[PDB]
Amino acid sequence: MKRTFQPNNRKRSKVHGFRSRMSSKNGRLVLARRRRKGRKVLSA
Amino acid sequence: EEEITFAELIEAGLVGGEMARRRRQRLGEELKIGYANGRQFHKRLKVFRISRDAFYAALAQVMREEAGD
Amino acid sequence: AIKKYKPTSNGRRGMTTSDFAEITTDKPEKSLLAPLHKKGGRNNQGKLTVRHQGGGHKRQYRVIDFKRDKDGIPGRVATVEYDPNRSANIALINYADGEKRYILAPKGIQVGTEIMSGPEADIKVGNALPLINIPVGTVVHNIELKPGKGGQLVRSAGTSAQVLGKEGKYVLVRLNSGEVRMILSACRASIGQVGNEQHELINIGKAGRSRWKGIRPTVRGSVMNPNDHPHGGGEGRAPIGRKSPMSPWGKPTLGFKTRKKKNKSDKFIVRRRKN
RNA sequence: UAGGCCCAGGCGACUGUUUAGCAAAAACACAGGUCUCUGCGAAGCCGUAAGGCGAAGUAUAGGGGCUGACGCCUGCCCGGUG
RNA sequence: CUACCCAUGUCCAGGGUGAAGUUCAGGUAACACUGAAUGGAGGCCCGAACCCACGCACGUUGAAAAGUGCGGGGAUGAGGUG
Ligand SMILES: [Mg+2]
Ligand SMILES: [Mg+2]
Ligand SMILES: [Mg+2]
Ligand SMILES: [Mg+2]
Ligand SMILES: [Mg+2]
Ligand SMILES: [Mg+2]
Ligand SMILES: [Mg+2]
Ligand SMILES: [Mg+2]
Ligand SMILES: [Mg+2]
Ligand SMILES: [Mg+2]
Ligand SMILES: [Mg+2]
Ligand SMILES: [Mg+2]
Ligand SMILES: [Mg+2]
Ligand SMILES: [Mg+2]
Ligand SMILES: [Mg+2]
Ligand SMILES: [Mg+2]
Ligand SMILES: [Mg+2]
Ligand SMILES: [Mg+2]
Ligand SMILES: [Mg+2]
């Protein structure tokens, strides 16, 4: 039973990473929302 | 052996001006061989190897549409 | 010739293939290649826009002279190789000043013959020269439309076009599809008919053999859902439930001519093709 | 540890693919056949446009529709619709 | 995760059958062909690893939110997989 989550770090950083979030207007919107709510972990 | 001669095109009224330009502009497309000058028209007649009778028939035809067919 | 396999199994039951009677070598020239990767019918957006394409054996592109501009310099045929991109075969030339190029190999030629490419070369297979200096009635291939751009008309294996008379700055030419058309007199052309004419008789034989030429299966329209095609849905094997068979994008596909009406080249087409 | 076999028919020529998790097939695909469009900035397709695939190809090539090895064959109707 | 595509790597114990071609002979008008030897083709055969999922039984607040046991199919390719 090959489950859905196959962990990997390079993929995670290239998809949900910080430098990827600060690469488009929408990503910066996401970061602004996260900051406003006050979360302790902005990106992945 | 040259089913049509140049003198035939000449007497057909196919030399310069505007009336003869209309004559060729009609006749050519009526024969599906496009436009040409006098000599070019004769050469096209030769290369497509069209028969004299059909040429005369289309000639009379276009004269009739000229005369209001 | 054509080699016929003997039916040792259902695979090769009717299969047949060529024999490469003319290929004189098997190793391409090293300094005349270039990378080329297949694209699987995907445009610059990563979207699929051409069905039925993908996969297949890796190839490597050969660079070919379609201009044939080196003139006054007598070349020389060296080999005849096999090109996995064309349909015809290509030959290798050794110009007397040390330069090597590839040429679409016309039928008949073989190693040793000489080549000339100026407006003074004589009428002979292989040679190339502008259309003006070409007598009437001869066959010719590899025609170009704009002067000094390289041939892009009849080019495949076995094809051949014909000259039909001179005019002021245009020439009357009948293409391979029976179409007649005026062409600028300043363009170049290549004498002789493209060789390897037997290419049309080959029988593929089995699914895999077409699979590894980069061709994928095609699903008939009449068996899809109605969501996916104007032919979908039905009783179960139902006929075309419309007034005319239609392409998957809802356009008629029998006799519906598609050439643009306002094309700015109709003043050069004296006799549209017939059949 | 290690093939049950034989005699008859229907379907599909064959190897292959398919409803992850109730359907593995006679369904799909296929080699072959046929019709049709396309003269090159080709036709078609994605995109509002640039830009692309088709193709670093050129009618013995490319797209679309139907049929589906091989053998014997494919009759009559153009009033209606296209 | 799954569908298809692109680039670059990698895996498939063992045994069968014997195409083309070639060489000999016989053979024929040489040919057609016949018979030996060589040769090693194949979406070929049997069968482990590997991949799949045809039958039955069990399980059904399960060992498991799709499995196990005994049999089954492909297994050099339209392969499997990183
Ligand atoms: Mg297609
Ligand atoms: Mg076959
Ligand atoms: Mg269905
Ligand atoms: Mg609909
Ligand atoms: Mg319907
Ligand atoms: Mg079957
Ligand atoms: Mg099967
Ligand atoms: Mg199911
Ligand atoms: Mg079954
Ligand atoms: Mg099942
Ligand atoms: Mg087909
Ligand atoms: Mg391009
Ligand atoms: Mg069918
Ligand atoms: Mg049937
Ligand atoms: Mg009928
Ligand atoms: Mg096998
Ligand atoms: Mg499956
Ligand atoms: Mg088991
Ligand atoms: Mg089997």
- DSSP of chain B: --SS-HHHHHHTT-SSTTHHHHHHHHHHHHTTS----HHHHHHHHHHHT--HHHHHHHHHHHHHHHTT-
- Closest Cβ–Cβ partner in B32, B40, B47 for C164: B47
Contacts with C164 from chain B: Cβ below 8 Å: 47
Q: H/E element holding C161?
A: strand C161-166
Terminal CA-CA length for chain B: 33
Cα dihedral value C116, C122, C127, C130, nearest 10: 100
Going from the C-alpha of C55 to that of each of C46, C185, C209, C212, C215, the distances in angstroms are 16, 42, 12, 7, 7
DSSP state, residue C171: E
- DSSP of A1-21: ---S----HHHHHHHH-HHHH
Hey, is C17 helix, strand or coil? Answer: strand
Residue pair C52/C215 in contact (Cβ under 8 Å)? The answer is yes
Which residues, in sequence order, are bridge partners of residue C252?
A: C246
At a CB cut-off of 8 Å and minimum separation 6, what does B1 contact?
Answer: none
Chain B contact for C148 (CB, 8 A cutoff): no
Distance between CA C183 and CA C146 in Å, rounded?
9
Which ligand is in closest contact with the Cα of C39? 12
What's the reported resolution, in angstroms, to a tenth?
3.1
Distance between CA B38 and CA B15 in Å, rounded?
7
